[PDB]
Design a protein around this ligand. Structure first.
Ligand SMILES: [Mg+2]
Ligand SMILES: [Mg+2]
Ligand SMILES: [Mg+2]
Ligand SMILES: [Mg+2]
Ligand SMILES: [Mg+2]
Ligand SMILES: [Mg+2]
Ligand SMILES: [Mg+2]
Lengths: 198, 243, 222, 196, 236, 250, 233, 204, 235
């Protein structure tokens, strides 16, 4: 399935997302960015049902951007994640629920701390040092249970991530075509363009 | 002609002229009615005037059978009268269906007064130009008279009278209850309570009545019914043998 | 659950056991299954517990308003008519089974209501998983013209049949007596035949037994 | 349930047993299955108890209203209100109703409204699970213009046979006699009708 | 929805003026039925004879005639038809005439309760045969209606009522359907006295237990010619 | 069928008055006096039964009403407006409070709901304000005894004592002279009876005066026994005889 | 009397009059003339079309409702469109549901009832158009006249619009002649064009002034304009 | 599958002498996969405590809903909501969603700030009230909890002792359920103060 | 809702006209708190001071309002404002920023100004709040639905006089205790009554909360006002 991992180090939150889009027996694309920037310091990654996935993300993006312009101010990671949870929680009892799981990574400027939020399509939210959706969690949680330290650098976090992707490339039955990696810290959001053979 | 004369909004005096004008409509028919309580019955008398000789006399009536137990006499124009009758019937039938017992007289009255109150408060509805007199022998309260007016006001009476010559009859009755000291006619058979009512109508209005001049409703335990000319004819003969 | 209702010469009595269960497990060993609709109209329920309490409170509330509106004591036939019409509307989805009993200005009344909205009248009735045990006691001892004391005995005995023979029922007996003249008397834990025996040992732990990681005082104020 | 209505010389009689069951358990042995929807219009119910009570309650409401406005309704009018309710909601009703009544004009009448919501005017009618056992007996023993005592006999005999064979039927035999005289409630206990 | 200081509704009173303004129409109750007649003003030789019908049927047993704003009358009859269909649907029996009266009654009255509606500009004479005899009614713009031995409305109402009073007097013991039809022709001819500057066409219908089987039928052919001749003879 | 007055009938005038609210207040003034007085251990509300006819039976028309077991009301102004407000007040105590918290609302909250219902008659399309002022007396565990006035605008104010209607300025005067913070309920009833005599034209007996209290719990009025934490209504309408008994020692 | 009484259609005058309706009637008298007449086999509409300018079109007065039915208009044109669209639908519904051609008479009743609701509803105006409806149904040729009051009458012939009184007096005079023109469309049209002539202070009726329609025993409703009318001027 | 089983978790409340205790585990799972080691299931509003077990999305939602309603309550009433009253507000709120219910098992603990009497209660998912005075249990290990409590409990326990009992009940019931555990938090509540302790427990 | 030829809204103007007869209300923002003071409408000895609030209302834990105008109208708006604050807290898990709440309430008012043919609310508000973005804040809104931000402001009667007096004595470095003094002086000077006594005042603060780091709304009790009326030297 779709790979969506995230890890919170001391000064940033790293998100990594599989690049494959697969329908039936064909890999249609291998450079897919499973991410939308919500605000300058908040990133969302998503996985689940084919259409709902992007549709939900862009919907959240429209709303958060609307807030920023109306208030000339950027919502905290914590506030954005509650807004997201409630949307999914309303969705689970509607006629056709959004089947989308998300990770929210943000740098809170008021507190000067990175924050990671894991939210499933039911609207279950939890703040975590590291998280994952789908089967990929079955490998990475225990890996990180061993390897992760709270005081790691952004560079150390990328190494830990390099370990997680290696494991999944070794053990997962599906070819997810690598990941796109994104860092969220005090200077905003940036893409590590070299990961496939770095 | 300001707006305070045309719809039910307050005037600077705190009055509601449309309500006041609706009271005037009640006498428009020039009919007098009176109602008395017996020991185990309630009787309503109303004048019956048939000016046109083209009219079928049987269809001219201001007394209505609301339910098995409840009768209503109306003072006011027939169309508004029939509007209230129909509604009362529907309310009576509905009460029984929803609550499993017959709607009491006083409760139907309170409800019809509440409807009237609404027309008193909402702009797009006019009040009805009628006064409603409800009678029965309530299973819990005994014989009952309850009367509602265009103001949404209602109350229970020992006896009551309504129409242009309301006052003549009221004082006549007030004088009777002054003497007797009790709050009803001490009499068993309804036939004699009907006779009493006719008598005190005659003395108050200073008029004799033939069988076609009157309309009578009787409410006893578990039935309200009206009298035909012949039951009235029989009642007029009875009063004639002494008075 | 075992609930019964028995008419007597001057009124009506209802009784129930005090056991609620989640499947095989006993949640409350002494709950009250006797409910008030109005002061003199009381109610016992089986089926979906929440449904029977809710339908009792809904109709109880509306009956209060009717009583105020009409200036009259609430009548049992009104409680019945409203319950049955409500239950019917929901075609059985509100799983309330009720024995409703009371005294009103027209006398004393005993009725049963089934979740689909059917009603019946009778002199003695039972509902609940314990109904057959109690019905067999009722069918054995009910006579016409019972005194108050005979009625309480009979109803109480019926609930015991349920307590001893139905795994769904247990613990204690509650009774409510409704006589035509008087105020209704609710008799909570009328019988208590199922007292727990004293345990063999005291399980109170020596202080310190439990290992603690961290600790802090919690603020209630502001 | 065993239920029937029979027209005779002077009016109509309705009869029923008094058993109600959920499965093989007798919920009620003394049910009154004979239901009044107007002074001299009564019905017998079969099918879902919830459905038939709710229906009966609505019909009685319509005929009380009818009577306030237009006077006494015919038995045909009663039957039509039943049909209307039964036909229009046929998807969520299990209701088998027999309508019987007496007025002075049309005398004694019987209508039957089975599961579909159709109406059938008949000299007599049987219904309920127990009725199936007495089709042959009834067809063989019914005559028009029977006396009161003869009709009580026919219903008593028929319903005893139906009670004998159908486990859903039983208890007492209730009857209601509908004539110009008025309304008469009858009851017959097992010790009488078994001995027939 | 406006009461005057003395308790009147001027709008209704003005509605009556539109009725008084209309063609004259009548209804006569006989011993087993009812007869309806109306004056059709021939405005021009271009109007097709027999082909501008005014008398309308409701269900199968009820006739309706009106004077005033014709459209207003059709609006009422439409409503009467809906109202009778609904009765028959629920109750199987055809609507009794008093029951039908009140249906129209309440409808008309409704149009005097609200500031956003105008009262009807018609009086309607209607009736027919039911379970217990013949009934004739007349209904005013206020919603007032009563039963009638005989009824008239419109321009010639005064002379028509005068003729109706005579019949009630000379015939207490009944009066047949066939006779009442003749008299209807007479009474409409006499009432035409006012509007004598313009020509008129006669229209009669009846509903009789023994003559039409309680169904509403139009008087046509020889029976109409007979009734016309009787009227033309009794006018001279 | 369908309203043509979908606009406010109470609008502002150039000087800032809301005419219909003022005109309704004028209607209150014309009405029969009613009053409330608050003691340490109770509240009393009283008013006069101004009978329409001597042929009418004045017990069939109560001016004092139970709203909840612990809350009662009385009014000055138009009777029918009161009657419907009572129905709605009773209903709203259930729909907005009892059906939610399983208990009856405290006085200030029920008052607040009544005030809301009257406020809306001031703003909605096609209606006139209610022509009444209410006095609402009650008790609740956490607030103690209280008395509130509610006006046709929807305003309410808590009072130690007040009068509304006809002789209200004189009666408010008489109360300011007599009230103190140490009054027992019997004292308050006595003061209430006295105050009402200055207002009352005709007879002054237990048949022409209507008087209710919010005092202690009446377990004999509950209707059932068994549950010891159910103690009975605090609202009690005094009887004709109970009144006459306090007029002899008046 | 005419004072506070013409504000809406929901107000009677003290004379019993509805002025809004009377004002709607005046928009007819203002409109251009049109004539209808029939025999036993055919029915004809003749209409004088009216331009705004010598650079403009002469606007249409005749609308087809079904194969066996159509109408000419006089008054507010947009109101004629609304009424003919409804009449088109009623004709349609009759075909589809009952496989039946709508009786011309029933078309009359339907129009009457529709106009009526607008003479009794607040915040709506009466229709401001007159109509002449012709058709051949199961009882032959018919002509109807419709007035926005709701009054509809069946006639042998008629005319509505400005100066129509001439043609109406003409047809009244010619009654016994034109009623008999059976099985001769061209002669019935001739009598129609000749009838519309008595209503001209205008002029010489041109190839663009004139609009003719016909329906009958073996002819569906058809419209003639321009060159196709030339042979009648 | 069964919504009350997806995430795991337990809550138990007990009364003592002039005190109440309420405890929960810390696990949040997704079937066999444990996701969160810090998921608390007890909340408070003024002096009223509420633990909730079941589907975590409904645990969160109902906390937010009860914060909302108690906040409004306090503003209108000018006092904090009491345990008895709050219990009723939970009930009717759950019952409001009768045919689309929250998949939760709520538990209410607290002391009445007027009368001073300890109060606990429990509910099924549609708001039926379990009114018991000794203990209340909820969650994927409720059978284990009922067992533990019915054995360990005696009335009128001193706060310091009641602590041991409720902790032992929770710990041992937790360890017989695959879906509960992973940490535990215990609240000891007296009219005047509230102490909160994180327990040391098996992390498997 | 219609415009006059001057481009003014009749009903709004007349609503503002009504408000200028209502008891004056004053708000003053200092560096470490806010003050709300207001004058009650000429009451009586028998009015229950203890259980009365006619001008001061809690909106949430961090925001309050002073009312000038129709109380019943204000209660309607206050209740919807309270709800709006709770929706926000439910949606974001953050207390609503003061401006957001003010803008919403203002928008409701504006709506009555622009459609529906209902009369406007005869209310003007002074909002006093704190949030982690703008610190202490003071806003005002009126029946037009316009709102503006202030350091010190008054609404109701004599705002003209009160504004001039506040303008003169206000300084940016004021402590709250100084602002308490200013507000009561200003009401004293602008009153239409013999003296400004405790029974004729409502008073509240939003301070930095004794000793903490949090924020405390203190709605003054009658006896407390009487004391703070002595300290400032008006007895
Ligand atoms: Mg009105
Ligand atoms: Mg109006
Ligand atoms: Mg057992
Ligand atoms: Mg059997
Ligand atoms: Mg006439
Ligand atoms: Mg479990
Ligand atoms: Mg475990």
């Amino acid at each position: 399935m779709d790979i969506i991992l995230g890890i919170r180090v001391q000064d940033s939150v790293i998100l990594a997302s599989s690049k494959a889009v697969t329908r039936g027996i064909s890999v249609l694309k291998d450079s897919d960015d499973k991410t939308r920037q919500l605000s300058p310091h908040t990133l969302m990654s998503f996985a689940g049902e084919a259409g709902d996935t992007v549709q939900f993300a862009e919907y959240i993006q429209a709303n958060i951007q609307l807030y920023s312009i109306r208030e000339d101010y950027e919502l905290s990671p914590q506030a954005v994640s509650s807004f997201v949870r409630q949307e999914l929680a309303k969705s689970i009892r509607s006629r056709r629920p959004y089947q989308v799981n998300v990770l929210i990574g943000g740098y809170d400027k008021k507190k000067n701390k990175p924050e990671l939020y894991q939210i499933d399509y039911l609207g279950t939210k939890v703040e975590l040092p590291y998280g994952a959706h789908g089967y990929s969690g079955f490998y990475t949680f225990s890996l990180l249970d061993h390897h992760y330290r709270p005081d790691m650098t952004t560079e150390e976090g990328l190494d830990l991530l390099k370990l997680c992707v290696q494991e999944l490339e070794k053990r997962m039955p599906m070819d997810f075509k690598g990941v796109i990696v994104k860092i969220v810290d005090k200077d905003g959001i940036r893409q590590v363009d070299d990961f496939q053979a770095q | 002609a300001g707006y305070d004369r045309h719809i039910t909004i307050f005037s600077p005096e705190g009055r509601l002229y449309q309500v006041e004008y609706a009271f005037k409509a009640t006498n428009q028919t020039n009919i007098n009615s009176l109602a008395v309580r017996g020991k185990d019955c309630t009787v309503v008398i109303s004048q019956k005037k048939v000016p046109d000789k083209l009219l079928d006399p049987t269809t001219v009536s201001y007394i209505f059978c609301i339910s098995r137990t409840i009768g209503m006499v109306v003072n006011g124009p027939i169309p508004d009268a029939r509007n209230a009758a129909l509604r009362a019937k529907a309310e009576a039938a509905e009460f029984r269906y929803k609550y499993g017992y017959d709607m009491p007289c006083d409760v139907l009255a309170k409800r019809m007064a509440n409807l009237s109150q609404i027309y008193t408060q909402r702009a797009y509805m006019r009040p009805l130009g009628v006064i409603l007199t409800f009678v029965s022998v309530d299973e819990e309260l005994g014989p009952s008279i309850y009367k509602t007016d265009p103001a949404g006001y209602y109350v229970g009476y020992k006896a009551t009278a309504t129409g242009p010559k309301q006052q003549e009859i009221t004082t006549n009755l007030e004088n009777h209850f002054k003497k007797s000291k009790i709050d009803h006619i001490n009499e068993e058979s309804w036939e004699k309570v009907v006779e009493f009512a006719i008598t005190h109508m005659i003395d108050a209005l200073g008029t004799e009545f033939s069988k076609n001049d009157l309309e009578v409703g009787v409410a006893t335990k578990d039935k309200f019914f009206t009298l035909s000319a012949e039951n009235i004819e029989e009642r007029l003969v009875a009063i004639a043998e002494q008075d | 659950t075992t609930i019964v209702g028995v008419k007597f010469n001057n009124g009506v009595v209802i009784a129930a056991d005090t056991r609620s269960t989640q499947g095989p497990i006993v949640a409350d060993k002494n709950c009250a299954k006797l409910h008030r609709i109005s002061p003199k109209i009381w109610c016992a329920g089986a089926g979906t517990a929440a449904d029977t309490e809710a339908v009792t409170q809904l109709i109880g509330s509306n009956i209060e308003l009717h009583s105020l509106y009409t200036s009259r004591e609430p009548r049992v036939v009104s409680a019945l008519q409203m319950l049955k019409q409500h239950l019917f509307k929901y075609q059985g989805h509100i799983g309330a089974y009720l024995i409703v009993a009371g005294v009103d200005p027209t006398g004393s009344h005993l009725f049963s209501i089934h979740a689909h909205g059917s009603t019946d009248v009778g002199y003695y009735l039972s509902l609940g998983s314990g109904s057959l045990a109690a019905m067999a006691v009722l069918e054995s001892h009910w006579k016409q013209d019972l005194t108050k004391e005979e009625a309480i005995k009979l109803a109480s005995d019926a609930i015991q049949a349920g307590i001893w023979n139905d795994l769904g029922s247990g613990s204690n007996v509650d009774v409510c007596v409704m006589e035509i003249g008087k105020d209704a008397e609710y008799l909570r834990n009328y019988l208590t035949p199922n007292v727990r025996e004293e345990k063999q040992k005291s399980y109170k732990f020596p202080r310190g037994t439990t290992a603690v990681l961290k600790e802090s005082i919690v603020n209630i104020c502001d | 349930t065993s239920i029937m209505a029979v027209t005779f010389k002077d009016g109509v009689i309705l009869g029923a047993d008094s058993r109600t069951t959920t499965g093989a358990y007798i919920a009620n042995r003394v049910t009154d299955k004979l239901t009044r929807v107007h002074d001299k219009i009564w019905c017998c119910r079969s099918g879902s108890a919830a459905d038939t009570q709710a229906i009966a309650d609505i019909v009685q409401y319509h005929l009380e209203l009818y009577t306030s406005q237009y006077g006494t309704p015919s038995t045909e009018t009663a039957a039509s209100v039943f049909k209307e309710l039964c036909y229009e909601n046929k998807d969520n009703l299990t209701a088998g109703i027999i309508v019987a009544g007496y007025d002075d004009k049309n005398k004694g009448e019987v209508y039957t409204i089975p599961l579909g919501g159709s109406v059938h005017k008949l000299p007599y009618a049987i219904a309920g699970s127990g009725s199936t056992f007495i089709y042959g007996y009834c067809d063989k023993n019914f005559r028009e213009n029977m006396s009161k005592e003869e009709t009580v006999d026919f219903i008593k005999h028929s319903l005893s046979q139906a009670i004998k064979w159908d486990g859903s039927s039983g208890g007492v035999i209730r009857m209601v006699v509908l004539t110009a005289a008025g309304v008469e409630r009858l009851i017959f206990y097992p010790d009488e009708y078994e001995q027939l | 929805s406006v009461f005057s200081p003395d308790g009147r509704n001027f709008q209704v009173e003005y509605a009556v003026k539109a009725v008084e303004n209309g063609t004259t129409s009548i209804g006569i109750k006989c011993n087993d039925g009812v007869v309806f007649a109306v004056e059709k003003l021939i405005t021009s030789k271009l109007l097709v004879p027999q082909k501008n019908v005014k008398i309308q049927v409701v269900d199968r047993h009820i006739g309706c005639v009106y004077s005033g704003l014709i459209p207003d009358g059709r609006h009422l009859v439409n409503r009467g038809r809906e109202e009778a269909a609904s009765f028959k649907k629920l109750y199987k029996t055809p609507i009794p005439i008093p029951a039908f009266a009140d249906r129209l009654g309440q409808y008309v009255q409704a149009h005097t309760l609200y500031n956003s509606v105008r009262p009807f500009g018609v009086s309607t004479i209607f009736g027919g045969v039911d379970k217990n005899g013949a009934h004739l009614y007349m209904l005013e713009p206020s919603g007032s209606y009563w039963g009638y031995k005989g009824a008239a409305t419109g321009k010639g109402r005064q002379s028509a009522k005068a003729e109706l009073e005579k019949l009630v007097d000379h015939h207490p013991e009944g009066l047949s359907a066939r006779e009442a039809v003749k008299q209807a022709a007479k009474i409409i001819y006499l009432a035409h006295e006012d509007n004598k500057e313009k020509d008129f066409e006669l229209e009669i219908s009846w509903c009789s237990l023994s003559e039409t089987n309680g169904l509403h039928k139009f008087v046509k052919g020889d029976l109409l010619q007979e009734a016309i001749d009787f009227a033309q003879k009794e006018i001279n | 069928m369908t309203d043509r007055y979908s606009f406010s009938l109470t609008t502002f005038s150039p000087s800032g008055k809301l005419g219909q609210i003022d005109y309704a207040l004028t209607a209150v003034k014309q009405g029969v006096t009613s009053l409330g007085i608050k003691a340490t251990n109770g509240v009393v509300i009283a008013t006069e039964k101004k009978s329409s006819s001597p042929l009418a039976m004045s017990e069939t028309l109560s001016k004092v009403s139970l709203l909840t077991p612990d809350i009662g009301a009385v009014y000055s102004g138009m009777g029918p407006d009161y009657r419907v407000l009572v129905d709605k007040s009773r209903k709203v105590a259930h729909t907005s409070y009892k059906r939610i918290y399983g208990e009856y609302p405290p006085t200030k909250l029920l008052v607040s709901e009544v005030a809301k219902i009257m406020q809306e008659a001031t703003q909605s399309g096609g209606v006139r304000p209610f022509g009444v002022s209410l006095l609402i007396a009650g008790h609740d565990e956490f607030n103690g005894f209280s008395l509130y006035q509610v006006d046709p605008s929807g305003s309410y104010f808590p009072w130690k004592a007040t009068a509304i209607g006809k002789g209200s300025v004189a009666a408010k005067t008489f109360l300011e002279k007599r009230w103190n913070d140490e009054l027992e309920l019997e004292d308050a009833i006595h003061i209430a009876l006295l105050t009402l005599k200055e207002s009352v034209e005709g007879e002054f007996n237990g048949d022409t005066i209507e008087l209710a209290i919010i005092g202690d719990e009446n377990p004999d009025l509950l209707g059932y026994t068994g549950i010891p934490t159910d103690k009975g209504p605090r609202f009690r309408k005094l009887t004709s005889q109970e009144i006459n008994d306090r007029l002899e020692a008046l | 009397f005419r004072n506070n009484y013409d504000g809406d259609t929901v107000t009677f005058s003290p004379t019993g009059r509805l002025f809004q309706v009377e004002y709607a009637l005046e928009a007819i008298k203002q409109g251009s003339v049109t004539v209808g007449l029939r025999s036993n086999t055919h029915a004809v509409l003749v209409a004088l079309k009216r331009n705004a300018d010598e650079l403009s079109s002469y606007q249409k007065k005749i609308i087809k409702c079904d194969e066996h039915m159509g109408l000419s208009l006089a008054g507010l044109a947009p109101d004629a469109r609304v009424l003919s669209n409804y009449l088109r639908q009623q004709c349609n519904y009759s075909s589809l549901v009952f496989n039946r051609k709508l009786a011309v008479e029933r078309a009359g009743h339907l129009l009457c009832d529709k106009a009526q609701k607008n003479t009794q509803s607040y915040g709506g105006r009466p229709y401001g158009v007159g109509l002449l409806i012709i058709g051949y149904d199961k009882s032959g040729a018919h002509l109807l006249e419709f007035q926005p009051s709701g009054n509809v009458t069946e006639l042998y012939g008629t005319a509505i619009g400005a100066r129509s009184q001439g043609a109406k007096t003409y047809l009244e005079r010619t009654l016994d002649t034109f009623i008999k023109i059976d099985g001769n469309p061209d002669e019935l049209i001739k009598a129609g064009v000749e009838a519309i002539s008595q209503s001209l202070r205008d002029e010489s009726l041109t190839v663009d002034n004139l609009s003719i329609a016909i329906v009958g025993k073996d002819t569906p409703f058809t419209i003639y304009d321009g060159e196709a009318v030339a042979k009648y001027i | 599958s069964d919504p009350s089983s997806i995430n795991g978790g337990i809550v138990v409340a007990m009364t003592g002498k002039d005190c109440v205790a309420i405890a929960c585990d810390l696990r949040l799972g997704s079937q066999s996969l444990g996701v969160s080691n810090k998921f608390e299931k007890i909340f408070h509003y003024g002096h009223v405590f509420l633990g909730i077990t079941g589907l975590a999305t409904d645990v969160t939602t109902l906390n937010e809903m009860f914060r909302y309603k108690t906040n409004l309550y306090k503003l209108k009433e000018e006092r904090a909501i009491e345990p008895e009253t709050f219990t009723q507000l939970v009930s009717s709120s759950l019952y409001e969603r009768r045919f689309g219910p929250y998949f939760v098992g709520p538990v209410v603990a607290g002391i009445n700030s007027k009368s001073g009497k300890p109060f606990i209660a429990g509910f099924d998912l549609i708001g039926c009230i379990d009114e018991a005075k000794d203990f209340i249990v909820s969650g994927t290990a409720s059978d284990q909890l009922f067992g533990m409590c019915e054995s360990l409990y005696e009335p009128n326990l001193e706060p310091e002792d009641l602590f041991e009992t409720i902790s032992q009940a929770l710990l041992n019931a937790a360890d017989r359920d695959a879906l509960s555990g992973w940490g535990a938090v215990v609240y000891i509540i007296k009219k005047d103060e509230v102490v909160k302790r994180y327990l040391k427990m098996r992390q498997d | 809702t219609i415009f006059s030829p001057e481009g003014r809204l009749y009903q709004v103007e007349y609503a503002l006209e009504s408000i200028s007869h209502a008891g004056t209300a004053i708000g003053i923002m200092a560096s470490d708190g806010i003050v709300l003071a207001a004058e009650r409408k000429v009451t009586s000895t028998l009015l229950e001071q203890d259980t009365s609030t006619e001008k001061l209302y809690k909106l949430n834990d961090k925001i309050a309002v002073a009312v000038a105008g129709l109380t019943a109208d204000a209660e309607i708006l206050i209740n919807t404002a309270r709800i709006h604050a709770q929706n926000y807290l439910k949606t974001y898990n953050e207390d609503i920023p003061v401006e957001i709440l003010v803008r919403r309430l203002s928008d409701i008012k504006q709506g009555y100004t622009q459609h529906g043919g209902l009369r406007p609310f005869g209310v003007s508000f002074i909002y006093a709040g704190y949030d982690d973005r703008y610190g202490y804040q003071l806003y005002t809104s009126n029946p037009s639905g316009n709102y503006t931000g202030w350091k010190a402001i008054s609404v109701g009667a004599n705002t003209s006089a009160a504004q001039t007096l506040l303008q003169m004595d206000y300084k940016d470095d004021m402590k709250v205790d100084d602002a308490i003094e200013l507000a009561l002086k200003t009401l004293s000077k602008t009153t239409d009554s013999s003296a400004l006594t405790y029974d004729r005042l409502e008073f509240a603060t939003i301070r930095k909360g004794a000793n903490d780091g949090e924020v405390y709304q203190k709605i003054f009790k009658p006896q407390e006002i009487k004391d703070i009326l002595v300290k400032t030297g008006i007895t």
